Amino acid sequence: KYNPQLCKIFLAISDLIFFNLALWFSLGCVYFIFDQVQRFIPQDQLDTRVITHFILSVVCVGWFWIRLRHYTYRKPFWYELKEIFRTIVIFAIFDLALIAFTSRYVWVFCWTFALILVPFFRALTKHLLNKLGIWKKKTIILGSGQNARGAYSALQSEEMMGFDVIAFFDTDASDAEINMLPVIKDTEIIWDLNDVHYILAYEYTELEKTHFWLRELSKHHCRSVTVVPSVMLLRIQNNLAKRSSRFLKRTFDIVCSIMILIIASPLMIYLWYKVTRDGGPAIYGHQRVGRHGKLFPCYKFRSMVMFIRKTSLDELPQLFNVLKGDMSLVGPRPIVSDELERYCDDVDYYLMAKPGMTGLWQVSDYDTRVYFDSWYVKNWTLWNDIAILFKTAKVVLR
Amino acid sequence: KYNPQLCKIFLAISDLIFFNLALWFSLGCVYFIFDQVQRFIPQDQLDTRVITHFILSVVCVGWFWIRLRHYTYRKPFWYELKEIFRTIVIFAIFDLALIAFTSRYVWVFCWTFALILVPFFRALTKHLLNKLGIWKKKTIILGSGQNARGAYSALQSEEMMGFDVIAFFDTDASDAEINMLPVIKDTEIIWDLNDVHYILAYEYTELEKTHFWLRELSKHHCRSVTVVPSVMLLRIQNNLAKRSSRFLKRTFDIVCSIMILIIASPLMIYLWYKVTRDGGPAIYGHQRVGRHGKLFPCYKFRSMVMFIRKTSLDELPQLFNVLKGDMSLVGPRPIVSDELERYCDDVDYYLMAKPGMTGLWQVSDYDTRVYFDSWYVKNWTLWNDIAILFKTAKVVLR
């Protein structure tokens, strides 16, 4: 039932309408709290101002349609969110330049509103549109090994893109069921299926096959093609080796930890009162390996004798720890010194960054955790920290 | 004697000074031809306007320093030049918008001046620094096969980059001289050399070695690293399959052919008068394979009985061909139908695009020409057309 043009039209309508609604909400709040905007913006400005905003609005959708191509190619939720935030803050810079060259409060209100609402309302409209069933588009995976099934699992890791993997294909598939999906070996089925999207996930040793398929989908002019690997210049950015990144992470850690301490102090104090009925220290320090291999006392709610565990509140006192600098909010899970050997050659990756209360594996065996922590350390960004923190809050809620 | 800090400082100073000098030149020309700018821009504007320009200027260098990194990483002259034009035209949108919310002639004059002068004067500055010996930085190549020597030759293809290859390295090198350069097999020489840049050019079958070297340059913290190959998403853009690109190429071809006709009509008419002394057609049509395999009469100056060839003027009448659509300026060299077989599986690539007066191989055996033409067809851009046309004019001059 997949329908691309209706999706694009609805998404553009949502973008324009809600981008205008941000400024209208700013106007309404200013009127409700101050009662006079003619005080602030005289009347003859309005139309002029608003039409300028209209122009900006269409420019925004233009930058999202013909340059960033949000309406023809699909990205995960978080990459979309980061790109949209960068675009909209750059647009806020544009409008600040326009206004300064001609109010701060109305500008801040409108654009904070926009940042909050445009992605959330895009999510709402795409969810309703998925409920309408023209969002999910049918896809065929090529490959019958671990790479294909892992990519399939990655696709189900976030349904909001709408890739419905309907069937697999591999001329030499050992099984008939991959992840309980039908397997196609005679390619005539594939070509008779032609709005069918394709995902190439052949393994490295079969990469040559992909090259053949790289030609195949070109011959019948199939534009919906995507390949996921198992004179070019790739710059691997070791972000954790930058002093500016470390200082920014320290500042963000301090601010967020202080804020959440302010938020959750009553609950922690109530837990203190309830636990201290036995007469002992409700908070204990356990030795763990931290940054550079440094041994630190992690502070935790006491769980044993001289409900919290199910709710996972026992990790709350670590914020005091974060107040001193031993760990961040986002990072590898703390482990004992005996568990260090299981990292093997990745030990250096485990010791390069401060540990975190939450990490990639917490929200996504021991080797899987080690690989996820190493990937987080190698590809650390502040955006990744925000995403992992939001996912951790989501997990806590569910 | 290589010096990065002096080069960066000089390049920034040149960029800023000449960006301001563009506006000063616009002011001077407007004054010389009009005699009154107070007519146009009153006096109290000047300082305000100029300081805004000053701000824009530093913004420009900022956008070239911390975002585009033109001062720490080296790019080919044409990629640099295209990126600089894109930056300047985006800034043109900026400044035209800034003026709109508050003259067309002065703005156009000033920033055509900037567009012409900033790249050319930056080139003059880096050539002067090359004469001063702080531009060429010493580089070590890794690899002893065809890929290493090919990357070496492609590096000498643009000496303005500033990469002086001083020695090779390969533990298993068969020879002692690669391109007559010294070869190292004990890496202790390389680590004793440590401002030494590195170029990894190991072949695909030895790619594993590069991975080891990928670690090696990491452990000694050598940040001057570069690799040239012999979940990622690579979108191969077949530009020639786009109707908009084809129409743009048609319009550009028409305009450029018309202007070349306007410029070169006296020379062509004179050569007509000189050749027609024998009483025959100075212009002849030779059958050649064109777009889609279409056979077309290519127009050429007559060279045989019933100086021009040395000067290569005999290819001038093909402009008339370009006027009808069988020829472009930039494209594969026209060949006879017997030469088609030598393209082999690449024949389809030879037939997809209109033949041009000049091509990539003309300015850069038969197989090399076929590969260059196929690469041009696959990776065609209007910027590539401009670069090849400029290189062809350069070749004609030399």
Numbering used by the authors:
A (entry chain B), B (entry chain A): 7 to 108, 113 to 204, 208 to 243, 262 to 337, 375 to 432, 438 to 471
Manuscript excerpt for this entry:
The structure presented represents the first monotopic PGT characterized in the native-like membrane of a liponanoparticle. Subsequent masked refinement and cleaning of particle stacks led to a moderate-resolution (~4.1 Å by GSFSC) reconstruction from 196,663 particles which was consistent with the AlphaFold model. Docking and real-space refinement led to the placement of 796 out of 1056 residues of the dimer. Superposition between the refined model and the AlphaFold dimer prediction results in an RMSD of 2.83 Å, demonstrating close agreement between the two models. The overall architecture of the WbaP dimer is T-shaped, with the two four-TMH bundles forming the central stalk, each capped by a DUF. The dimer interface comprises ~780 Å2 of buried surface area, involving 7.1% of the residues of the protein. A modest (176 Å2) interface is found along the four TMH bundles, with the C-terminal half of helix 3 (Ile99 – Phe107) mediating contacts. While the C-terminal regions of helix 3 are within interacting distance, the N-termini (Pro82) are ~32 Å apart, creating a large void in the center of the dimer, which is presumably occupied by phospholipid. The remainder of the dimer interface occurs at the DUF domains, mediated almost entirely by the β-hairpin domain crossover discussed above. The catalytic domains of the Lg-PGT protrude away from the dimer interface, placing the two active sites 77 Å apart. A predicted helix-turn-helix motif from residues 337–369 of the catalytic domain is also disordered in the experimental map.
